[PDB]
């Protein structure tokens, strides 16, 4: 059970990367890339901007 919250609003510049909202918290966010991450939003897998988002758990 993983959860991540975005500090600001970001827009993914790739088909594999997705965007999220500050209040909109996602789950299943694990650290895969030294600069990027990967989470799951209601069954939506993608990349999380480590520069705009942050891993809670």
């Amino acid at each position: 059970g993983i959860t991540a919250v975005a500090l600001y609003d970001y827009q993914a510049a790739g088909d594999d990367e997705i965007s999220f909202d500050p209040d909109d918290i996602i789950t299943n966010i694990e650290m895969i890339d030294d600069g990027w991450w990967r989470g799951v939003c209601k069954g939506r897998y993608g990349l999380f901007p480590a520069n705009y988002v942050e891993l809670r758990q």
């Binding site: 030294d34 600069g35 901007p49 520069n51």
Partner: peptide
Amino acid sequence: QRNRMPPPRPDVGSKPDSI
């Protein structure tokens, strides 16, 4: 100033050779 511009994006294609 009172406002601050957004932070830069991480290097997705570019990466350092060392730590």
